[PDB]
Every structure is written in C-alpha cells, then in structure tokens.
Design a protein around this ligand. Sequence first.
Ligand code: HEM
Ligand SMILES: Nc1ncnc2ccccc12
Length: 289
Amino acid sequence: LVHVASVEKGRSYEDFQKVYNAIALKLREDDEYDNYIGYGPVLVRLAWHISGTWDKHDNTGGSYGGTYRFKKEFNDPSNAGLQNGFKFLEPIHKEFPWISSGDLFSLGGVTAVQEMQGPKIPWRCGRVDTPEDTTPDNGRLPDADKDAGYVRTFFQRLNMNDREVVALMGAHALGKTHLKNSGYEGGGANNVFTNEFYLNLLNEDWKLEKNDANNEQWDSKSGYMMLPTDYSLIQDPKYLSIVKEYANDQDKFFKDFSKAFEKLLENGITFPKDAPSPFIFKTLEEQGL
Ligand code: HEM
Ligand SMILES: Nc1ncnc2ccccc12
C-alpha cells in the first residue's frame, strides 16, 4: 500500500499561497465563532484528526486520501465538532476546486497555526482523493480518559516518540473542550499559538474533578482545565522533563512542534525524489495583507 504524492496538474507555490491567503482572510473575517475564539483551533484539530487515523503497520488511514469527506469518518464520534471546520473550508474549496481534499484539510491546519502566530510549518502538496472504501473505520483516534502509558503506546502507531508527543500536545494551548462534543468542560480559551500549555501544566494549582458528563478532568482555581491525558505529561517522569524544557524554551517548542506537525500531516505519503521541495507560506502579515 503506497500513496504517491501527485502534484495537482500545473500547480506551483503561488497557487497554494492563494489558497492559504483565502483561508487566512476568512479566519480574520469570521471572528465571532465559538465566543470569539474564531476558527483557528478547530482547523488545527481537523488537520490532526484527518492525519491521526494513520496506521504505520499497513499504511491505512492518514491525510492522503481526503477520506474525512465520507460519512463514515465525518460521523466518527471522535470527530464531533469538526463539521464546523469542514463548513469553514467549504467556500474555500469552491473557490479553488483544483486542490485535493487532503491537501485542503492539511493546509487549513498549517494556515491556522501560522496565522495564530505559531511557527512556520513547511507543507507539501500532492495528496490525492481516494475512494469511499479507503475510509478508515472509527476508533483510531485517542481517548482522553487515559494515562501516560496509554498516550505513549497510542502514538507509537503514528511513529511518534516522547518528544514528538509532548510537542504535538502543545496545540492544546489552543481553543477549548465543549461538553456536547467530547464530554469535557472547557475553561479559559486562547487563539494565539504559544508554549502556554506547558506553563499552565507546571504553574497552575490543579484539582481533579468530575464534570457534568461524569468524566474526570483537572481544573485550576484560575479557570483552566487539563484532560487526564494532558495531565499525564506531568505524571510520567520522561514526559515531565520535556514539558519543563518547552515551558522554558519557546523557540525550541516552536521548532519541535513544526517538525512533528509536518511529519503528522505527511505520514503515509511517498514523495517522489523529483517532487517539489516543501512550501513555506508567507503569513498575511508578511505580505502586507
Ligand atoms: C492524546 C491525544 C489527544 C487527545 C486525547 C485529545 C483530545 C481532545 C479533546 C477531547 C478535545 C475537545 C474537543 C471538543 O470538545 O470540541 C480536543 C480539542 C483540541 N485538540 Fe486535541 N487531543 C489530543 C491530541 C491533539 C493533538 C496531537 C493536536 C494537534 C497537534 C490536538 C489539537 C486540538 C485542538 C487545536 C483542539 C481545540 C479544538 C477547538 O477549540 O474546537 N489535539 N482534543
Ligand atoms: N485549552 C486547553 N487546555 C488544556 N487542554 C485542552 C485540551 C483540548 C482542547 C483545549 C485544551
């Protein structure tokens, strides 16, 4: 099972920069969503969920095939709330229907990270839409009620090591949980990409509580929350060391997140040796737009 990247016919950097710019301008425009968080966090989560179905053992799932567009995946209980992201991207796809679905979903996440002042994330084109029978079954995305051993084992399936796991989880600086989507009660929310997930873990006064959906979560006096799987990163001594590193080095976190997030979004894709190099998109800010 090989998925070879195939550039959309006749497209180059500038075509994709136009798609980035459309996403970015819409992110700026549509600011009221989710109590003024805007769509950045949900677009990051969408890019992660379409990629996180991957299985290194048989190369099933992953971002390549764009299979989130099919009902089995769109309706995965793990994906509840991502329809908001899909709906955001709908007009973008109508404007630029030459782009593949997996390229659009993944590019939405890159764009969101960068427009939220995160690191640059190099991005490669060429995902090709595959048929409905290539859609992975539900149940490949992670549970939140578990411990560090579960997190470590889960992420081995995605070929991610300790450092890559802790880096990726820093995206939980962004946005919030919603009781109706996941059974977790959100606290204070943010739409700027920083290392604050790690600083919150280490600095806040946490108390384990049971929410109104009967699930356990860690709540701070200041109004923040952590999932059990978030909090696991300070319970396990290997994860804790890395949490401390990132809480103490913003640039290191940015560089490691960038690498891990590109790798997540590329897992399962074979890039020909003569494929274009990764693209690094300019932000709206860098373009004076
Ligand atoms: C053990 C791994 C993980 C678990 C169990 C987990 C679980 C969750 C849950 C329960 C939510 C709330 C969904 C809702 O109620 O709307 C959430 C939101 C989020 N997740 Fe994760 N997640 C994990 C890893 C990641 C990774 C690797 C990323 C990206 C790099 C990510 C990015 C996000 C973002 C940005 C949101 C906020 C969405 C919003 O504000 O609408 N998550 N995740
Ligand atoms: N803002 C968040 N803080 C801690 N953990 C999270 C987990 C999922 C989404 C958002 C957060």
